[PDB]
């Protein structure tokens, strides 16, 4: 069936969601190891991850913005749309809504979660969120 | 300065979230044990907590209407709007847009969070996911 990819680019990993059957939750896929300084990107292994599915649109977890004046990552950001775009041909979308970065360690702290692992999921765990902030957005 | 208070109404208790002093982001305050069968809404509680506060909106959980028709719990918390509404002569929201429940939910079980303890936090949040899904509307 078509399903809505879901993209966290960052400077060592890229982070891969898919939308379930029913565009109803984002499940994780994988974190893509890459890197920049020698121009890695991941895009070989999305390529491959994503052949057996048939993807619409993808959406990409974009840094807000310093009140209308774009940062260095939202800038690597935005050239990273054009590529998936012009790349898959497919719709890219810019989003942030989700369930923040603090309310996840507030809530992982009162689940009683040692820092540590509360980074490690913090970090794994950037593009099922913004994927499933997107479906949220979408199913209402 | 003027706060915004939020709740979750359940059977047995009364969840309580405040905003900040800013207006961008909510606060967990206490769970009021209460006993809805009795007509204890904790309401008695519930203005201790807010004495020594200035509130000038209430924002409570509501459930969503399925093509314009809502269960028991809607049907309570629908009233319990025109109590506090009319008690405290503040406004008070009704707020049926859903929360990020399965995202915590998904973000705790990638934590290796029990079964059990996920269930705590959540039910524990609930005010407090509420309050902020208003917050981020204005």
Do not use: C
Not at 89 to 97: G, S, T
Request: glycine share 8%; aromatic share 6%; no cysteine.
């Amino acid at each position: 069936s078509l399903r809505i990819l879901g993209l966290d680019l960052g400077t060592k990993t890229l982070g891969v969601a898919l939308s379930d059957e029913m565009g109803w939750t984002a499940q994780g896929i994988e974190t893509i190891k890459i890197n920049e300084a020698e121009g890695d990107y991941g895009l070989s292994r999305l390529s491959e991850l994503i052949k057996d599915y048939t993807i619409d649109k993808i959406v990409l977890g974009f840094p807000k913005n310093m009140n209308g004046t774009v940062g260095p990552r939202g800038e690597a950001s935005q050239t990273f749309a054009k590529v998936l775009e012009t790349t898959y041909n497919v719709p890219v979308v810019l989003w942030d809504e989700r369930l923040t970065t603090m309310a996840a360690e507030k809530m992982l702290i009162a689940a009683d979660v040692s820092r540590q692992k509360r980074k490690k999921v913090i970090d794994k765990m950037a593009a099922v969120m913004i994927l499933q902030g997107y479906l949220d957005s979408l199913n209402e």
